[PDB]
From a paper:
Apoptosis-inducing factor [name] 1 ([name]) is a NADH-binding flavin adenine dinucleotide (FAD)-dependent oxidoreductase in the [name] intermembrane space (IMS). It plays key roles in [name] function, respiratory chain maintenance, redox control, and non-caspase-dependent cell death. We solved three structures of human soluble [name] (aa 103–613) by cryo-EM: the dimer (1) without interactors (termed “[name] dimer”), (2) bound to [name], or (3) to MIA40.
We obtained reconstructions for the [name] dimer and [name]-[name] and AIFM-MIA40 complexes at global resolutions of 2.8, 2.6, and 2.4 Å, respectively. We built atomic models of [name] aa 128–611 (lacking aa 511–557 [[name] dimer or [name]-MIA40] or aa 511–549 [[name]-[name]] due to flexibility), as well as the interacting residues 232–239 of [name] and 2–20 of MIA40, into these maps. All our structures resemble reduced [name], i.e., NAD+ bound after CTC formation. Consequently, we observe the hallmark re-orientation conformation of the “aromatic tunnel” side chains (F310, Y347, W351, F482, Y492, F508, Y560, and W579) connecting the central cofactors and periphery of the C-terminal domain26. Concurrently, a loop connecting two C-terminal β-strands (aa 487–489) releases W198 of the so-called β-clasp that is part of the regulatory β-hairpin (aa 190–202). Consequently, the C-loop is released, providing surface accessibility to the binding site of electron acceptors or a second NADH cofactor. The [name] dimer and, in particular, [name]-MIA40 show inter-protomer variability predominantly of NAD binding and parts of the C-terminal domain, whereas little displacement was seen when comparing [name]-bound protomers. The inter-protomer variability of [name] within the [name] dimer and [name]-MIA40 suggests structural asymmetry within the complex. This is also reflected in the variability of local cryo-EM densities of the sixth β-strand of [name] added to the C-terminal β-sheet in the dimer, as well as in reported inter-protomer differences within the dimer. Although NADH leads to rapid [name] dimerization, dimers dissociated with a half-life (t1/2) of ∼4 h upon removal of excess NADH.
Numbering used by the authors:
A (entry chain C): 128 to 516, 558 to 611
B (entry chain B): 128 to 516, 558 to 610
The structure:
Amino acid sequence: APSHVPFLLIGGGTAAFAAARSIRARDPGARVLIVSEDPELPYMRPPLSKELWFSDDPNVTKTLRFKQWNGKERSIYFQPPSFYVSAQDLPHIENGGVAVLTGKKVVQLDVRDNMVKLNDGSQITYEKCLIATGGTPRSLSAIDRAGAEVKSRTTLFRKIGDFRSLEKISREVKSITIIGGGFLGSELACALGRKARALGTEVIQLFPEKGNMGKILPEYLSNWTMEKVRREGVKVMPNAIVQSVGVSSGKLLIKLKDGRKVETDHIVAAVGLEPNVELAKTGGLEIDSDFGGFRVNAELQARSNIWVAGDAACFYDIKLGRRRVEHHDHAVVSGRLAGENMTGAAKPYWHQSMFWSDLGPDVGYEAIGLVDSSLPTVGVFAKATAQDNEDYGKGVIFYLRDKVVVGIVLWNIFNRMPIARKIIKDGEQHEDLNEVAKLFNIH
Amino acid sequence: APSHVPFLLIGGGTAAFAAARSIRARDPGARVLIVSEDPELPYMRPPLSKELWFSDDPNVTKTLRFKQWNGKERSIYFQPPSFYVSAQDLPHIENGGVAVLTGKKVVQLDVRDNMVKLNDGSQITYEKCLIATGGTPRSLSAIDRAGAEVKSRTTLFRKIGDFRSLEKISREVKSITIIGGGFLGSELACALGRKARALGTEVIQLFPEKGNMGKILPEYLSNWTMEKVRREGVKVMPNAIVQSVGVSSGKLLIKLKDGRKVETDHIVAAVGLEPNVELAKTGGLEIDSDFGGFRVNAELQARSNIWVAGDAACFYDIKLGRRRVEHHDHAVVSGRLAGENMTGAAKPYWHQSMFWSDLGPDVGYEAIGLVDSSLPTVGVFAKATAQDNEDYGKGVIFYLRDKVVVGIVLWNIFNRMPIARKIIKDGEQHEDLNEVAKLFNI
Ligand SMILES: Cc1cc2nc3c(=O)[nH]c(=O)nc-3n(C[C@H](O)[C@H](O)[C@H](O)COP(=O)(O)OP(=O)(O)OC[C@H]3O[C@@H](n4cnc5c(N)ncnc54)[C@H](O)[C@@H]3O)c2cc1C
Ligand SMILES: Cc1cc2nc3c(=O)[nH]c(=O)nc-3n(C[C@H](O)[C@H](O)[C@H](O)COP(=O)(O)OP(=O)(O)OC[C@H]3O[C@@H](n4cnc5c(N)ncnc54)[C@H](O)[C@@H]3O)c2cc1C
Ligand SMILES: NC(=O)c1ccc[n+]([C@@H]2O[C@H](COP(=O)([O-])OP(=O)(O)OC[C@H]3O[C@@H](n4cnc5c(N)ncnc54)[C@H](O)[C@@H]3O)[C@@H](O)[C@H]2O)c1
Ligand SMILES: NC(=O)c1ccc[n+]([C@@H]2O[C@H](COP(=O)([O-])OP(=O)(O)OC[C@H]3O[C@@H](n4cnc5c(N)ncnc54)[C@H](O)[C@@H]3O)[C@@H](O)[C@H]2O)c1
């Protein structure tokens, strides 16, 4: 570890890599260090839930390569190891370069001293710092209250090791349970159902909502998505609240708060993510209370020489207000912006970030802005229509704050993202939405 | 007037003057422009309610001079007019200077181009900017729902013009009624009661709590302060919720919720302060929701080249969380810090700020930290009365968050600020608040 670096990037993930590329682009000859707790080079997580599961290659868990939108095979890793220079070489190599320090954890942050302390005891002084620590999966209360053997048969799905372990388990066990109905739980349910269709094993999804992804989509769309997920070979059990999890004859037993009971062999828990804010206690950094994570301004700035990007950043969007987004594209855009601002720009967060999803062949969408179930929605579909506050195969769902669009879900329509982005950018008063819904040309 | 200014300070008051002084101290040769909507040069407010009333000099309204703790007469203004340079003279002068552009209001703030627009259409481009606007007095629903005649007879007390108007009114009218029982209301009640006792007129105070300063002091000290204010010649009416204000035979009449009716011919309204945050709408600046005002960090910074100081800043205290202090000492300290940080330092707010108050001769106190009656309270007096949330001439009050001292009120003891400041600095847990009050000479 070098004793001083011009640019420090805490956490090795999407945001840190994007920031390193921006810093290198704007300031040629910059010398960037990335301190990562994972023993791996930066990689993208989205393939860990969809693409690596549908790969035809048998030995994919060891290879980690997949086909793209075009179909050209690529790796999850952002860059090959030859791209990164050694940390010791970093302050000596010509025109700089990015170096990655893997297996290291920053445990202390002295803002005034412009210093951090690693887990092994090494101390690194910086000129500019980015905190791009992400989040960690939340555990279940009933699972925690159970014994050690119950926790041994539970899985939290974030990293590559989780993907490999879950793939081997699905190959070797007879039934797996998914708890949670958000993004990760639903995608895992679809992938595991696809894998289990061949042999004929059982996969179960149970959660306390009315349907799949009930915090994002309206009720009717949630029920439609639930039915589509059931069509993939998954037994979905909505409105289920876990009371206790136990052991019976070598199989774990789920006793719900209701009268229903479930007996299976393995549990996958996808019950949310919480940001890593253990570093704020020693850094004297403010933690947001409404959203969680570090609190930063419109330029993602926490202190004089400290920026925060990614999932842990509770930033201030000027158009939409205080936010905290947890998505791949937001991590890329936010890291790019923080890298621009670390070299000397003063740009606020302006370009909006989107996200995408695919819950099987039938369901596939992209969304932008503020998308939430509590906010008023206007669903203009094809062959159907519904507004809140049957053939829902195609359509657009506007989200309105005060007669103004703040988020758009584009349901099974493609190459119509710029229209939605321009609608969000203009931010006009919209008392009528069928006049604008024709721009996407749903029919 | 100049097209480009290195250092712009929006709003000229206590914080702006302190910031200009810090800028000049750290960076000799600087060129500071102060844009103020007032027609006057910066002055200090605290003597506008206490010192200028007790002066024996007849024409203090014009001189605006008063005596102090040392006893040396000084002006209400921070500096004499010769100290400042002209606005057109600022760009080209050896070692620069400070120029105040009085009577001009900043109406638009464009952070993208680093340019502001004044109310006369002139544009000024800045390199660093400070927003040191203050607050404006809050009005009353009963007053605002009334007619123009009732509005013309009520007073909101912030500036020098209000002080002159109220002094003339006190010399003229027979009865004065004061709404509000916080700091300003109690101080004006004491001053006008002294003047009335000197003359022989009537002064009345009404507020919706059970005692004076019930949002700062505990209940028993609130009752004690209410009694002591009554001894000053002021008829105090606690628990008076105002319903409507009207006129009857050329005299104002107040009808309260409980049924009491009070007649008078002038009203002084002092019911709080609302921060000036109209610049945030056009500047893309974030306004705090819990406390109000511009939301800044521990370094009092809002954007890349923008700092906020004074009563309008909702800053983050590392040791005490989110705060918004509205006091003269805090304005001085925060303006000083923001002026230092505009020149290159990155110092967070660490030095605490205190506040004092004198309510007659018997009651005089100082306070520091988080002082609020909502927090659990332990008071050490001649008889040790601990509050759960006799003679109380002298004592100390500790305010607790959870077994930790966050604010201390010093009751009729002086030259003991450093002890309380040191106690608050190292906020370690205490088994009981006693044996700590021994540090103060009770
Ligand atoms: C299985 C899966 C599938 C996903 N699919 C999608 C998708 O299809 N679309 C989408 O938009 N989003 C998707 N996401 C979300 C997206 O991947 C995340 O939002 C994104 O990875 C967040 O990037 P980040 O850099 O903020 O955090 P992360 O990617 O979590 O990186 C955080 C890194 O920082 C390290 N770290 C933390 N604390 C410290 C410390 N103190 N010291 C050192 N290192 C530290 C961690 O170990 C980790 O390596 C998916 C996520 C998962 C898990
Ligand atoms: C009568 C009175 C007595 C007080 N007594 C005490 C006391 O005994 N002890 C104590 O601790 N505190 C006391 N205070 C409180 C203390 O005086 C204030 O908290 C302090 O003055 C706040 O300073 P500031 O610089 O933030 O605001 P201010 O002093 O209000 O300065 C704001 C200035 O900015 C100007 N401005 C506003 N908007 C704009 C704009 N858009 N463009 C240009 N200029 C603008 C305003 O006109 C004003 O000149 C008293 C206050 C009053 C009114
Ligand atoms: N396609 C995508 O964009 C995508 C895909 C995968 C993951 N992700 C990200 O991964 C992260 C983690 O995913 P996640 O799905 O775990 O997050 P999430 O926030 O979607 O998970 C919350 C889900 O768990 C349920 N839940 C909450 N508490 C519960 C409890 N006590 N018992 C049972 N159910 C409970 C909620 O009602 C909801 O269904 C998120 O940041 C998410 O955005 C995104
Ligand atoms: N000694 C000092 O520190 C001092 C002295 C004077 C002024 N100041 C400052 O001057 C500013 C103005 O003082 P203030 O006394 O107006 O503010 P304040 O916030 O102290 O006033 C609160 C008082 O107004 C009362 N009130 C609120 N709403 C009311 C309503 N609808 N009807 C009746 N009463 C109502 C409250 O009950 C309380 O008695 C404050 O910022 C204060 O800090 C400080």
